[PDB]
Design a protein around this ligand. Sequence first.
Ligand code: HEM
Ligand code: HEM
Ligand SMILES: CCCCCC[C@H]1C(=O)O[C@H](C)[C@H](NC(=O)c2cccc(NC=O)c2O)C(=O)O[C@@H](C)[C@@H]1OC(=O)CC(C)C
Ligand SMILES: CCCCCCCCCCCCO[C@@H]1O[C@H](CO)[C@@H](O[C@H]2O[C@H](CO)[C@@H](O)[C@H](O)[C@H]2O)[C@H](O)[C@H]1O
Ligand SMILES: O=C1C(O)=C([C@H]2CC[C@@H](c3ccc(Cl)cc3)CC2)C(=O)c2ccccc21
Lengths: 124, 438, 75, 85, 54, 383
Amino acid sequence: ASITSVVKTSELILKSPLLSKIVVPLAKTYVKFSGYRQLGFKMNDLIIEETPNMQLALRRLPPTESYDRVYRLIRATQFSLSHKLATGNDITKPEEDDHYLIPYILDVEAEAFEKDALDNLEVV
Amino acid sequence: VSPKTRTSNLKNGLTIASESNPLVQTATVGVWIDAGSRNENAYNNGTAHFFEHLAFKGTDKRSQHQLELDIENMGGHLNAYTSRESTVYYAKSFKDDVPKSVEILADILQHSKLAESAIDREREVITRELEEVNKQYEEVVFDHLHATAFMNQPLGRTILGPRENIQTITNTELRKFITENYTADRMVLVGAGAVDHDALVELAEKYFSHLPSSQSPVPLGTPIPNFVGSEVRLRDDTMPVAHIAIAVEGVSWTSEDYYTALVAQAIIGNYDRAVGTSRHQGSRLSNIVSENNLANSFQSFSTSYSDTGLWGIYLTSENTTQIDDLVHFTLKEWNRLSTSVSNLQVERAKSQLKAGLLLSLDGTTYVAEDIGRQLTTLGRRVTPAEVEAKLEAVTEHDVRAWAQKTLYDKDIALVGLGPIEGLYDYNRIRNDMSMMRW
Amino acid sequence: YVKKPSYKIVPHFLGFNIPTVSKWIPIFGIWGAAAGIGALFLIEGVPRTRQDILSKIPIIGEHWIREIPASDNPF
Amino acid sequence: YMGWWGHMGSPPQKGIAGYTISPFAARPFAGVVHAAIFNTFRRTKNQALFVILPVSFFYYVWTQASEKNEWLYTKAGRHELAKAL
Amino acid sequence: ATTFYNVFVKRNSAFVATILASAFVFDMTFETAIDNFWDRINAGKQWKDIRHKY
Amino acid sequence: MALRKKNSLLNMANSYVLDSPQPSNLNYFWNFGSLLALCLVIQLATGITLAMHYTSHASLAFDSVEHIMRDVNFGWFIRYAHANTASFFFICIYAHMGRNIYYGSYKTPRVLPWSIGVIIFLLLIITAFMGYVLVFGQMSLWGATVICNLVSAIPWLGEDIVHFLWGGFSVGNPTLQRFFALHYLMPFVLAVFALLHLIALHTAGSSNPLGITSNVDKLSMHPYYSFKDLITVFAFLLMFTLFVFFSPDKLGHPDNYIPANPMVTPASIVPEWYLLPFYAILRAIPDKLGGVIAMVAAILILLILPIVDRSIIRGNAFKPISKLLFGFFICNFLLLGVLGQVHIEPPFIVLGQICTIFYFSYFLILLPMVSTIENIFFYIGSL
Ligand code: HEM
Ligand code: HEM
Ligand SMILES: CCCCCC[C@H]1C(=O)O[C@H](C)[C@H](NC(=O)c2cccc(NC=O)c2O)C(=O)O[C@@H](C)[C@@H]1OC(=O)CC(C)C
Ligand SMILES: CCCCCCCCCCCCO[C@@H]1O[C@H](CO)[C@@H](O[C@H]2O[C@H](CO)[C@@H](O)[C@H](O)[C@H]2O)[C@H](O)[C@H]1O
Ligand SMILES: O=C1C(O)=C([C@H]2CC[C@@H](c3ccc(Cl)cc3)CC2)C(=O)c2ccccc21
């Protein structure tokens, strides 16, 4: 599934008061149990990147954000192989779990989906 | 709505065609001739281009130097080009300098000295032009492409002609050439810009009245070409960019498929990585090429002649290891003209052409070139309304029908110049002219 | 005067649209015939194929009606 | 998508210093007791529910089915078996 | 002749269909033709030729 | 430049077993690939050895297997090793497919090795089965009958195909000899496909348990994974030894020590432990064609995991809901296994049907739905 899909659907939920009231607490618990923060990941580090679109989004990251992503992945790989969890400052605090990549992939995909749409346009 | 193109004849059969634009202050008058390199045989090949040089080498009245001064004093410039089927001699000037320019053009065409001393002088200049076109890769490719596509036929000859001919061209055979070919019934005096038609016809009655008429006056744009599927490879590993042209036998100016072939050409389109917008063009090939950096550029063309044409594509690429992909994808895009095109591509290309055919004409020299080209190839100027009607008549079914008879599984003329090690042999290229899946 | 270009996006899926696919419908037809002809040709030897298909074809079908005389048949 | 040594296709790395020591210089079993007890308990506890829930449910389901099946083929289960067939 | 090319050869689907249908026809006729030929060159030799005695 | 890199042949070996860059954090579930390689090597060695002693003729086949057990030096070992490794091959291959499903190894960019893998899984089933038949005990003959009658499901031509695969009107000598030929052949085909799915994988490299790229942190295949794979080699051989030497018949059916009698089938028909899940599927469906389709579809449906998993995240390490769903799916596949070996009686008939529906609903309903919802929970949950 595309990140665009996921983001638009999430926005539909956050709009509806009823929906957000029941879903936002679920999703926050889900994320706590997911436990990716315990390896010092940001949510966006876990998005599948072996795709044309994502490779392009990752090339668009500012050098700073890109270097830090590499570090978090290296560090998480090291936690994984040691079967340890992050401790202290390595644990991702909720305030640090920023969607650094979502804007870039949404732009990549916006263009890719526009391209598909316009490839199928019919002059009227 | 552009102003009406007025057309008059003289007694000898010279056509005068004019399109006034009272919004501009310059004017391009010139003479379009339905004659070019094609009108030579093999012995005098190169004569037409030779003459173009000698036209400005002085007349019975004005010497070379006097000629130079007369035009400098006019203010504008004179220009000429000889192609295979058409010779043009025009003069861009100011509005009120038009009587001078018509007078100068009439002089250089009728009353050229062609002095043995000047023939001998230009014989070196033209010989040196043979080894300096070498640089203009586009032209080298297209000259080979004609040479191969129309192997040992008049269209296959170059314009400059072989070295051997340049050394043996005499003032006699030059005179004979322009007496046989530059006849009134084969010429069109064209004025665009700040010209009055009635004034231009008077200038033609004054200057071009004693032009020879041919014995057998055929209509303008009257022609037997047998295209050869073939390749020329001019591999040059030292060159950084490969230039490849691929062409099939295309359409003549007067073909029933002329607009269909232009539409088809617009579906494949042009691409140039140096233009900002090109990565976003609708053309399927453009998308493949830009995403994969397969080419620096490609340019579809449909060159027409009186009785045949070439339709094809000209590619440039620095991606020397993926030329196979570049050619593969290009020819697969042509295959889809036969197998896949629908109203989606056809209507898009028609929209882009409906504008394109009118966009081209943006200055007096372009207008004159359009009047002149149309009058010497079709015998009339086709109005924008008629052009819009002929384009509207092109349906998706017509494009598929045309592509299936002209492109699909047809022999190609392929010319490769440069680091084309990666271009496969002729069979593998020609195999891409069909789809086994269809 | 024209204020906006006049178009729609045709429905599409995996880069196929109905205009394009409709142009290939005939070709699937022929390939289906080729697969039919070819498949039937492959199993022309199968006795069931003769019994149930090929012997039923008018005129031509007698090609596949062959009885071994019981004098020459051990089974 | 993956390259090879030298051009693996990592986004450019900068600013990570990696240090390790020789296998001969390290105790391979350092803190093995701690890990074997406390680390394995941690990892087991965290995954326990993902195993326990489906195993316990399908063991319950199997148990109920096997007990019913056993009972149907007793004398007491004659009538319920006759209905089942 | 253009027509024949356009119908049976231009589309590969059509060409392959034509080749397989031709193979069908050839296969059936070749079998029958060789059977008759084989019986003529080995006339009076084969079981079918002496079978009538029994 | 190093010889191992210079020489074309060595360079191919090098690229697979020595310099191959692997993620640094593969856990023990990445070891099944090499165990399946070891099983495949054991099977080839013991198999070719049994082929030197086994006689394919139906009048002699069962007796040649007894001769192997009794007269051939170490024949007992070779026979039991071959039979038991066939069981271990399936433990390892379900483990390996398990690992792949749990960690989303089937997702792009690894759909090709996954899909080739699904074919290896089918070939293993056919190989192991064809090998089961060669003993020509009671279960062997009956198994042959059923597998060769699955093509009767195919309408019209079906019945004739059955006779063609038997080379007779029943399973008999012809069938047994052609099963021998193909059982010898099929493993080499399987080793080709095993190699191919590795070659397909070599474009993307192994996945890893985090499901993130490993391009940031790679380890040479040797020495790290070579030595890691020895641990499981020795753990596998310990389990192998316990079966082969101490309980060689625990994984077997007694009935296969009865010679094939085409006149009776044993009242207790229960196939190999590894075919049991699909056998329960076949029993569940009360239609001939239905039952066969469902059973084959239970394998072929793995081919659609690349489509129906809609997750933006690769694998289940970080997806609590998906992990629970996967746990229930795995346990249901084990329940199907169990139901494959009970008697066809109430209440297990209905239960087997419910488990069959749950098996398919994982691919068709639950996975697409859960993966969609978790996408949304990750995005909302992290804002
Ligand atoms: C003869 C049987 C098989 C052998 C010998 C084999 C061997 C291997 C090996 C050595 C690897 C790389 C290391 C590893 O990840 O364990 C691997 C990876 C893989 N195998 Fe298999 N395999 C076999 C059957 C299968 C089957 C049946 C499937 C799928 C249904 C499968 C799918 C894969 C996939 C998807 C990978 C990539 C997984 C990843 O590393 O993330 N294989 N296999
Ligand atoms: C994946 C590879 C293989 C698998 C999964 C496999 C599986 C089996 C199985 C389950 C049996 C039934 C064993 C029994 O219960 O006695 C068997 C028998 C046999 N296999 Fe294989 N086999 C494999 C490879 C081979 C190969 C390569 C040969 C080479 C000929 C071979 C030769 C035999 C022979 C001769 C028998 C019958 C003798 C016997 O039952 O022990 N196998 N195989
Ligand atoms: C001798 C060169 C020939 C190349 C093929 C030989 C084998 C080969 O490539 O071995 C490798 C060691 C490979 N393992 C891995 O990729 C591997 C990768 C990552 C992690 C681990 N382990 C984790 O902890 C691994 O184990 C393996 O076991 O795959 C066999 C199946 C291959 O056999 C074939 O395909 C051919 C035939 C015998 C099946
Ligand atoms: C028993 C069967 C006989 C052949 C089996 C042997 C192993 C399988 C090899 C077939 C696959 C070869 O396919 C190709 O080989 C080359 C040559 O090493 C390898 O190439 C790989 O390593 C080399 C250098 O080590 C790198 O330059 C390259 O980027 C990388 O892809 C890859 O593995 C694969 O791209
Ligand atoms: O009735 C059966 C039966 O149904 C299978 C079954 C189970 C697994 C099936 C299978 C599973 C998966 C695939 Cl991809 C193909 C076949 C093959 C047939 C047997 O193996 C069997 C063996 C001995 C006696 C009876 C029987």
